């Protein structure tokens, strides 16, 4: 998506 959220790229990585 154009708007990147945090539960897609959370600090879990």
UniProtKB/Swiss-Prot annotation:
Which of the residues bear the PTM Pyrrolidone carboxylic acid? 1
Per the record, the domain of life is Eukaryota
**PTM comment:** Neurotensin is cleaved and degraded by Angiotensin-converting enzyme (ACE) and neprilysin (MME).
Protein name listed in UniProt: Neurotensin
Species of the source: Homo sapiens (Human)
Give the positions of the site Cleavage.
10-12
Q: Which span of the entire protein is present here?
A: 151 to 163 of 170
